[model samples]
Each structure stands twice: as C-alpha cells, then as structure tokens.
Target chain A: RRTQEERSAATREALITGARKLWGLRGYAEVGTPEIATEAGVTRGAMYHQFADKAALFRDVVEVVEQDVMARMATLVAASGAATPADAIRAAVDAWLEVSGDPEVRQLILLDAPVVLGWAGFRDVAQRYSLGMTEQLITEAIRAGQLARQPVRPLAQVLIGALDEAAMFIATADDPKRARRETRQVLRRLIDGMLN
Target chain B: RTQEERSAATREALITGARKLWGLRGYAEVGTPEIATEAGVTRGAMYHQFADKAALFRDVVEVVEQDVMARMATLVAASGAATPADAIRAAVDAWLEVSGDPEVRQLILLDAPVVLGWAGFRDVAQRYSLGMTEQLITEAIRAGQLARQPVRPLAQVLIGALDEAAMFIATADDPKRARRETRQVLRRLIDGML
Candidate 1:
C-alpha cells in the first residue's frame, strides 16, 4: 500500500491534473469544484481537504501552468544556441508565440487570467515571470550595444503587450497558422526597428 | 418644451449621468438604482428607457467611445506636422495622454471589454478607434514617412503596445511619472520604426 505521504501527494497531483484539463478547456467560471472532484476521481471531502475552494484550486492550477509555460520558453531559448543577445531575445519571442498557440495556454493564461485574476494580479504574475525575463533580456541587449539604450521596464511592457495581443490574435484566428506567420513577420519588423 | 421633447431630454440626461457614474466606478459593481439616482431619474424611468443594466451600460459605452474618437481626431488635426511620421507620433502621444485619465482607462480599456465580451468590444473598437489608427499608419506609409509594410499587422502591434502602456500608467502608483516614461518609450519605438 502507498504510504500516507505518497497518497497525499497523489491526490494533490490528481487534483492539479484534472483541474488543469477542465479549467483550460472550459474556463474557471464554467468548471465547478464538484465537477473537478469528479474528474479527479476524488471525493468532495478530499478536494476540500486539498483546496480551500474553487478559486483556491484555480490559483494552484494557474501556478502550475504558468511555471510550465515559462520553463518551456526558457528551454526553447537555450536550445536555439543563439550567438547574440538580439538573437536570444528573438528566439524567446518566437518560442512564446509557438507555445502560446497551444489551446490550453491561450485559454488559461491569455484569455481568462486577466479577467479572473484582475488586471493588477495578472500583471504582477506576468511581470514576475515572463515579462521579468523579457526585461532582463532587453537590458542585456542594450548593454551589448545590440539595441538602443531605452527604459528597460517600459520597453519590456510594450514588447510583452505586442507578444500577448499577437498571441490572442493567432489563437482566435480562422487560419491560425497563417496568422502566426504574419504576426512573426510584423514582430520582426518592430524588433528590427529597436536595433541600434 | 413639449412632453415628448421633455422625455427625450430626460433620456439624454440619463445617458450622460450613467456615463459619468459608470465611467468613474465600474459596470459590475455599480447598480441600476444607483445609476438612476445619479441621473436624477426614477428607476422606473431608467427601466422604461433601457431594457436592463447591460443595455444602459451599452448606451454609455457608445457615447463615451464617440467622445474619445472625436477628441483623438481633434488632436490629430491640430498636430499639423510637416511629416506623416511626426504627425503619427504626435497623434499617438495625444491619445496616450488623453486615455490616461482614470475614468477613460477604467471604462474603455478595462471594464467595457469584460462586461461587453471580447468580440463585442473588438467590434466596437474596430468600428471606432482602431480603424483610425490603421488609417494613420497607411497615410504614413503612403507619404513615405514610414517604410512600406503590411498596415494591419503593424497597426495592431503598435496599438496593442500603446494600450498596454496606457493601462500600466493608469494603474501605477505614480501615474504622472509612468506616463512620461511610457510616452518616451512609445516615441522612441515609433521613431525607430521610421
């Protein structure tokens, strides 16, 4: 038999996995705690034991998904083996666009997060992770003389905005693949303008 | 005034008052009774005029959006810059500044989209403000002030960035300083584009 610690861990994992699928597919508002419990094959009591409520469970789900998305982006950048900071930044953007095309990422992270978490909360979480890294990358590019010396924070915000809206456009497009290609082209022109 | 004209005036008054209140507070938290009181009309009158809270808010958004576009058009015309690039820059800066107002930021940028739904919000924006920006970009390209590009994509990116900056400034603790900084970044980006 699994130890109590192992069982507890299993229950938490199940909850996270089930909730991610349901919330990512249906949205935070549509999926109920009971539905989540049923999907996870856990009792309502067990779900309550793990999470304070539906919103609490959603918080945990977002945390897991956001981390995964950010980590995947980091991996893509590293794998690009870019020679310059500019290349690295471009690679990062490209990776973000690619990964964000995932229905789950588009729905959970992009479409729903702002409304559900509140703009400030969404901005805080994004700045801490994705936007934070973008700022750091831009700072490096400036230091290396690849980009103009501009205010890093605002520049990052603008860049993040472009990436996010572009992602949404692509996500909802009738022809997403074509939209992605066009968006990348536009992004290149904008980023090229930033070069010194 | 005739009774029918008087009723029309009251309806107009209600729309104006609801816009002010909803623009200041928000749609979700503000109630119909409160809006009616603010408008100096009875709740019964409000219901008679509007189908419900959502319908009333929709009218408010339509009015506010028209004002915003007209204000933006005035700014663009007044710029009168020799070069299209400079003109575009001035217009964008003016828009960012005007939209930085807490009321405009909360209503047009934040609350309306969520309350109206994304597609509805997109439709309203495209019909008004976004189309205006797209036209400006096209003008810049035609005038040789900017590099020839696919207009829609560039416009989308630029508008998105400006909006993001506006929201950032609006929500910041020190809005004045944030506004200055964001405006600078925007100017630099636009200049860099040219």
Candidate 2:
C-alpha cells in the first residue's frame, strides 16, 4: 500500500488492461492515447509518464495478450492425461480450438496482433508459442507410433499455418459459428490424414 | 444519321458506358454525373435521362459483369477437356479465385449484391454454384481414387467462406502472390486430402 514500487506496478497493470480494452473495442488504427488515458482513469501526464508513447503502450498490450492466449494453450497441453497419442491429439485440437474461440484471446491473437504489428512482426512472436505447442503435439504422436516417419517441425508448420488461417477466417467472417464448425471439421480431417 | 435515332443511340451508349465504369470504379459513391461527363458527355442530360440514378446504373453494370464472368467460366468449362465432373469443379474454383481482382466483380459479388439485392439472393447464388461443385467432388472422392471421405456440405461451406474471406484479405493486404499461393495450396490440400 505504501510502497512506490507497488504503486508503479498497479499503474502499469491499469494501463495494460485499459489498452487491451481499447484495442478490443476500436481496433489498432482507431484508438488513441487520450482515449486510453481516459479509460485507464489516469491523467494524460501520468499515463505518458509511465510509457513512452502510444506504440510503446501498444507493444506492451500485444505482448501481454499473446502470452495470455498462448499460456492457456500451454496449460491444456500440460493437463492432457491421454492414455494414447490419438487421444492426446484430440485433446490438443480441442484445447487449441477452445483457446482460439475465446473473445479476448481471439481479439489479441487473431485481429489486433496481425492488424497492428503487421505480418512479419506479429509472426515473430506468434510462431514461437504456436510452433512450440504444435511441436509438442507432433512429438507426442510420433513417440506413440501414430504418424509415419516425418519431421515434427514441418508438420507443426503446416498444422499451425492451417489453424492460423482457419482462425483468421473465423474471426473475419460475418458468420463466425459456421467458420468455427468448418475449422473443427478441418482439424479433424488434418489429424485423421496425418495419423496411420 | 443526323437528328433523332443516332443521338438516342449515342446517349444510350454513354449510359451503358457509365454503368460499366461504375461497376469498375464503384457506384453513386463515385459521382455518376462526373462519370456521365467522362463518358464523352455532360451531367444535365444524363440526370434528365436516368432519374433513378444508382438503381438504373447498378442494374446495368451488375447484369453485364455477371454475364461476362459467368460466360467466361462457361467457356472455360466447355473448353477445359477435363472429365464431366472435373470440368465443373475446376471451373467453380477458378471462378471463385477470379473475383479477387478488379473492384467491379468483387464489389458486385461480395458487397453490393447483398446490399442492393437481399442477403439471401447472394447466398442462394453461392449455394447453387458450390452445391454443383460439391456434388462433383463428392462423387470423385466416393470413387476411392481421392483417398478421403466425402465431406460435401463441409466443402461447400469452406469454399464459399474462403473465397469471400480471401478477397477481403487480398484487398486489405495487396498480396497478389500470396493470394495465388493460397489458392494453389488450398486447392491441393482439398484435392490431396480427398
């Protein structure tokens, strides 16, 4: 309560939360510094005092959101106590789709991240988390003799690319439910095709 | 050639030309009076002739563009030399990718068609095309040469959804190469998975 460090930490958290909400509501190009300051319930001077500028604030928000979404997926994979690789694969697909469907997660990973940071910059952060999870899934499958001899990295790239593209479609379409159903079906197809 | 009939034909031609350009550029949003003048005339007689403005203009352009694109696909299908089934399926996919370029086809199909007409009108048009293609692909897959189970409804849904979505992406990003790559990859995956 009394500590300066604690106050600064609270201030940063407030700013990040406010930025997330702004990005979610209006998208990257539309939201501005004053609006963020207002939403954060902080003085403009106080907000700028903590962060260098709008882009700096945006970077923080994207990083936080990316980590949050990726973390949920990581958690699901860790928790899957599948007796066999096929079951683990199913669990991974379900977990991945579930995480992708969450509103905050979708806004962050699918919409704002790509639209704001541009493609190359967004992919840099996204690929690490996505590739890691996909690699783990493929590794699990291979160890249990599900797929034939194929490298995990390439397979992971294909799957992640498919999922990202599918998720992007789901987010962009007017009918997201149909997009989600299509995505689930595609995921099932891809998994079935991959496995022996 | 002097007075009545020729002038009427020239004015009609101008209207037709403006309508075509509107589909290329856009609609009443693009200043029809200016377009009429650009079609080798002026705004006064243009407005006098077509009082309904965009309604008439959109009808003219939409009909022409629809006819042209549809004819192109039909010609391709007739000439493709692929089997009866493969001809229709290939033509449908080719037509879907063709709309990604040039604002007229895109605006009419993706945006204006639904707004100018009803939403259901565009949906039904899409459903018919995809339904035909799905029937063909389903048959091919069922014959076991395609190596996957038939997902006709799913294919219909995905193809329609992806076509529109891909157009939006192509417009927003301006990635022609990537669009082509996506088309090729998706076609292969659909065929390969089948």
Candidate 3:
C-alpha cells in the first residue's frame, strides 16, 4: 500500500487543478474553499492543510498560468526574426492575443488576478512577468531612436492598458479571427504613429 | 399608481437606491433586501426586476456611465468650436474630470469590472461610453477631422487608455497632479492619430 505521502500528490494536484478550472470559470472572489474542496474531492481540513489559504493557492495558480503565457511570447518572439523594438512588441502582442483567447488565460491573467492580488501586488508581479518585458521593449525602441523620447512608465501603462483587454474584445466579437487581424492592424497603427 | 407608473417607479427607485448605496458603501456589504427596503420596494419586486445582485449592479453602473456620457456629449455639443476631433478630445476630458473623484471610480473602474465581469461590463460599455466613443471616432474620420484609418480599433485603444487612466488617477499618490498629467498623456496618445 502507498504511504500518506503518496496521497499528497493526488490531493495537491486535485486542489490546484480544480481551483484553476473553477476560478477560470467563475472567478477568484466568487469561488472559495468550499467549492474548491468539493471539487478537489477532499476534506476541508485536508485542503486547508495543503495550502495556507485560498489566496495562497491562487498565487501558485497565477504564477503557473502566467509562466505558460509568457513562455509563449518568449518562444514566439525568439523564433521570429524580429528586428526592431516595435517588431518585438508586436510579436509579443500577437503571441499574447493568440494565447489569451484561451478561456483560462483570459480569466486568470486579464480579469481576476489584478483584483485578487490587489493592484499594488498585481502591478509588481505583473511588472516582473508581463509589463516589465513590454516596458523593456518600449525602452529599447526609444533608445534605438526608432521612437520619440517619452516617459516610459506612462507609455508602458497605456500600451498594456490598450493591450490587456483587447483579447476580451476579440473573444466577444462575432468574428474573432477578423477581430484579431483588425485589432492587430490598429495596434500597428498606434506603434507606427509613435515611431520617430 | 397605474401599472405603467408602478413599473417605472419601482425600476427607477431600485436603480437610484442601488446607485447611492453601492457608491456610498460597498457592493458586497449591502444586500438585496437592504437595497429593496431602501428603495421603498419589496425584495419580491427586486427579484422580479433583476435576476440577481450583479444584474442590479450592472444597471447601476450603466446609469453612472451614461451620466458621464451625457456630460461629455453636452459639453462637446454646446461648444461653439467643437469639431469631431475636439468632441472626441472633450469626451475624454469629461471622463478624466469624473475620474478625479473616487465615488464613481470605486463603482465603475474598481469593483464593477470584477463584480460584473468583463462580458457583463462590456454589455454596459457598448451601451454607453465605449459605444459612444466609437461613434465619435468614426464620425471624426468620415468628416476628415481625423487621419483616415480604421475607426473601431482606434476607438478601442483610446477608450482602453481612458479606462486605465481611471485606475491611474485613483491609485496615484496625488490625484490632482495625476489628473493634469494623465490629461496630457491622453492628449499625446490621441494626437498621434490626427
């Protein structure tokens, strides 16, 4: 027979799996330990014993999902022969929108995390993962003399702002494929307009 | 009251009551029954009127958004020198003015996006501000006030920037300075298109 330690694998995976699915479907605020425990098919004490709290469990879930999302950007941008800072950000945006159409990415990354983590927390973690990368690309573009000199933070903030919700708009559109191309063009226009 | 009057009154009462309560307190802190009693209507009427709490919250946020939209439209329409571009510019200015105060921002920008969800909020968004912004941008391009380009996507960026602008203003160390600075940045963002 398996030891107690063996149960931890199934149980822990169950909790995280069910939570990611449920939170992706409903939300972080709406779902809690009750449904999470039920979904995990374990006792409340077992679920509680595993993670410190719901928010704690959610943190792991976010990091896991965010890594996967950013990895796509990393992989896509790496393979493409992206030449300029604008080229890099565009490819990054393209990868982001492409993956963000997946329901879980939209819920966890775009909608729930900021509210759950607190914007104070959200912005920091987001900077480490998503925003910081975009800011870097924008800064590079500026340094390369491809873009007009401008404050980086506000520029990055608005760029992320313009981007983060766009996939949701595309998802909500009747023709998502068409919406994607149209949105890509619009984003290109903004970047082209910004070019020095 | 007549049936028509009763219907209108209950809906109006429920909406205005939720708006005041949701703004003053928090959305979760207040309950449906509390909202009904405050509105001088029964919870039965509240249920008949709205499917759930979020539905009610959506209506409240929609009304608040529409109110700001009214200010934007009126300001631009009333301005003697307002072109389509100027109207689009002034529209965001009005939104920025409202963003300075926390009352509506707490409802629409902060809590509403999470509570109502993006899909639900977009239902309200397309009804009022986002939809209105798109219309102005489309007209601006058609009238040659804006550079000839795709209207819908450009509208989305400006409106999206404005949405983030609300959060920026709300979270700033000093909101007054945030207002002027954000206004300038938004102006720069918009001027790029023209």
Candidate 4:
C-alpha cells in the first residue's frame, strides 16, 4: 500500500524513457500527458507525480538530449588533441553541427527547444552551458599564441553567438550537409581572424 | 489646449524619459512614475500622450531602432565606400561604432529584444542591416576581398557577432575597454577572410 524510494525513482525514469521517445517521434504539441502516462505504463497520478506537466516533462527530455549534445562537443574537443586550441574549438563546433542535424535532435533540440522554452530562455541557458567551455578554449588559444589576448568572456560570448546563428541557419537549411560545410568555412575565417 | 504641435511636445518628453529610465533599470522593473520624473512631465501628460507603459516602450524602441538603423544606413551608403572591399570595412566598422552607444545598446539592442523576447531582433533591430550585409558580403567576395562562400548564412552570423558584441559592451564592467577589445576582435573576423 506504499511506494518505496526505488519505486519513486522507477516512475520518474519510466516517464522520461517513455516521454523522450514519444516526443521525439511525434513532438510535444501532438502528444498529451495521458498518452505519455500510457506509454510509460504508469498511472495518471504517477505522470503528474513524475513531472509538473507536459512542459516540465518535456524540459527533462530537452535537458537529457541537450546534455548529450553538450557532452559530444566536450568529447570532440578532448579527443581533438588539436593542431591548435582553435582547432579544438572548431572540432567542437563541428560536433555541434553533426549532432544538431540528427533527426531527433533536429526536432527536439534545434527546432522545438526554442519554441518550447521561449527563444531567449533557450539562448541564455545554452549560452550559460557553452560559455565556460568556449572561454576555456579561447583562453588556451591565447596562451598558445594561436589567438591574441582579449577578454575571454566577451570573445567567447561573441563567438558562441555567431556559431549559434550559423547552426540555426544550417539546421533550417534545405541541404544541411552543404550548409554545414559552407558555414564552417565562414566560421574558420572568423576563428582564424583571432590568430596572433 | 491640445493643439497638434504642442500636444506632440508631451509625447517627446515621455518617450525620452522612458528610454533613459528603461535603459538604466530595464523596461519591466522601471515604472511610469519614474519615467515621468525623469522626463519632467506629469503622469497626466504621460497617459494623455500614450495608452500605457508598454505602448511607451514600443515608441521608444521604434524611435531608437529608426535612429540607429538610419545611422548604419548612412555608414553603408557613403560615397567613400568607393570600392567593394573597402565598403565592407566601412560598413562593418561603422556598425561597431554606432551600436557601441549606451543608448542604442540598452534600448534597441538589449531591452527591446529581451522585453519582447524578439530573436526577431533579426527582424526588427537587425532587419535593416542583414540585407545590406548580404549585399556587402557578395560585393566583397565578387571583388576577391572575401573568399567565396555562402552569402546568406555568412551575413546572418556576422551580424549576430556584432549584435552579441553590443550586448557584451553594454553589460561589460569597463565598457571602454570592452569596446576597444571588441573592435579589434571584430577586425580579425573580417581580416582573416581577406
């Protein structure tokens, strides 16, 4: 007649498991919490218990997906053992392009996250997430004489903004593969411009 | 007497007051009374000239957007931009100069976008520039000052960099330092391509 801690954790994970797959396939607007409950094999009580509402559930789905994207960027940077620190940064951006173009990511993270989270809300959150990594990369670039010294925070902030808009363009492109390559060249010129 | 010429005078004060006060503390937190005080007009004068605070903010944003966009247009339209390559520099650098203003930074660039949450800033604040930016990038590439690449996306991100730079400058601890540093960084983004 009572739920254990594991049971509570089970409902939360089950809901996320079911919700992410459902939202990925159909999108949040088309789906409802009740369907989400059925998919998770949980009670309506459990659905509300797991998340405040659809958005709250979708937020977790967004976060789970976005966190993976962020992790990919980080992994690319680390594995890049770069030709330069700038190269490391470029690699991470490359990963951003690749992952964001994935169909699941395309619908969930790139296209819909902005719509669902409020656009500026997405920018500030994405900005906060990426800022530290970009700052570190730019700092290393400057230290290695790959870039001239500037305010790391400002440079990273500006560069990330530039990268973001470019990614949006590619994500929305008719030909993502072609768009990705072109934006990278433009971005390279931008990154190389900082070279000391 | 609500004569047309004199009636518009109250509108001017309210717009100026709202812009300045809103720029300082942002649009939401600042109120009509503070704006009226800063403007040195009566609260009655405020509503006499406008329906509400948001209407006042909209007027302030449009005025600021018009002024700044006009300045950017002048910088690009100069006969001094005699060549395509140099035109890119003049237009690009001129943008950095104009948007560096505290008023432009806070009002049109920062508050308006955040106020309405207009990433549509691309449409409103930046709409005037992007088409012009695309043309200049095309001109630069055609002249070989810039390497060939996709023009449209280039312009989008390039303008985005400047927009973010203004945001950086506005909120920076040392705005003068922030600007100089941004000015130089902006140079490489252009120079590297050349």
Q: Residue by residue across B45-123, what tens digits does model 4's lDDT show?
A: 7888888877788788877777776787787676387877777767667877788677776676556554554344445
Model 1, C-alpha of A193: deviation from truth (Å): 0.6
- Residues B24-100, candidate 1, lDDT per residue (tens digit)? 77776788888788878887777888988878767777777788889887877787866778778887677886796
Q: Residue-wise lDDT of candidate 1 within A42-125, one digit each (tens)?
A: 999988998998877877777888889989988998889988889988898789888898889888887777667665666766
Off by over 4 Å in 1: A1-9, B1-11
In angstroms and one decimal each, the interface RMSD of every candidate reads 1.5, 7.8, 2.2, 3.4
Chain B, per-candidate TM-score: 0.87, 0.57, 0.89, 0.72
List of clashing residue pairs for candidate 2: B146-B194
Candidate 1: the clashing residue pairs are: none
Error of 1 at B16 (Å): 1.9
Candidate 2: which docking quality band? incorrect
Q: What DockQ does candidate 2 score?
A: 0.07
Worst 10 residues of 4 chain A by lDDT: A118-127
Stretches of model 3 off by over 4 angstroms after superposition: A1-46, A53-55, A110-128, B77-81, B147-150
List, residue by residue over B44-121, the lDDT tens digit for candidate 2: 666555666645554454455565456546755766636644553365356545555565454444434333432333
Q: Each model's fnat?
A: 0.45, 0.03, 0.31, 0.55
For model 2, give the TM-score of chain B.
0.57
C-alpha lDDT (0 to 100) for residue B50 of candidate 3: 94
CA lDDT, candidate 2, residue A189: 74
TM-score of candidate 2 versus the correct structure, residues matched by position: 0.54
Error of 3 at B170 (Å): 0.8
Interface RMSD score of candidate 4? 3.4
